[PDB]
């Protein structure tokens, strides 16, 4: 679920998902169009694609379980949709951690009109 994703994001990065990743660049929190602004925004692009791979799942609300095996996220078995959602979220949280070094606060609340063009998944 979105709330679990946000807890995963905070755990990985120490930033709060709202506001650090809820309105960032072209794809975080409200993606759709545009060239992603940086690597963090590409994490969100890929995460959006990842959810897009699951048209009959409901990643905003469906809850999954995961645990940590020293540091590492391990998705626990739920329904097929929960497993696949968890793997999307795990990847994005790891991606955000891998790209913290280039996170830029100037992409928070990034205006829509600066995001133009479709980029295929």
């Amino acid at each position: 679920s979105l709330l679990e994703f946000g807890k995963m994001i905070l755990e990985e990065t120490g930033k709060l998902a709202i506001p650090s990743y809820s309105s960032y660049g072209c794809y975080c929190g409200w993606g759709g169009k545009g060239t992603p602004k940086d690597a963090t925004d590409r994490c969100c692009f890929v995460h959006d694609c990842c959810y897009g791979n699951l048209p009959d799942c409901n990643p905003k609300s469906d809850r999954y379980k995961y645990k940590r095996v020293n540091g590492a996220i391990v998705c626990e078995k739920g329904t097929s949709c929960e497993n696949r959602i968890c793997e999307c979220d795990k990847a994005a949280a790891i991606c955000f951690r891998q790209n913290l070094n280039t996170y830029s606060k100037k992409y928070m609340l990034y205006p829509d009109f600066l995001c133009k063009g479709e980029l295929k998944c």
């Binding site: 994703f5 998902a17 990743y21 794809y27 409200w30 993606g31």
Partner: peptide, 5 residues
């Protein structure tokens, strides 16, 4: 929270 695309 987030809630994109």
């Amino acid at each position: 929270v987030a809630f994109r695309s």
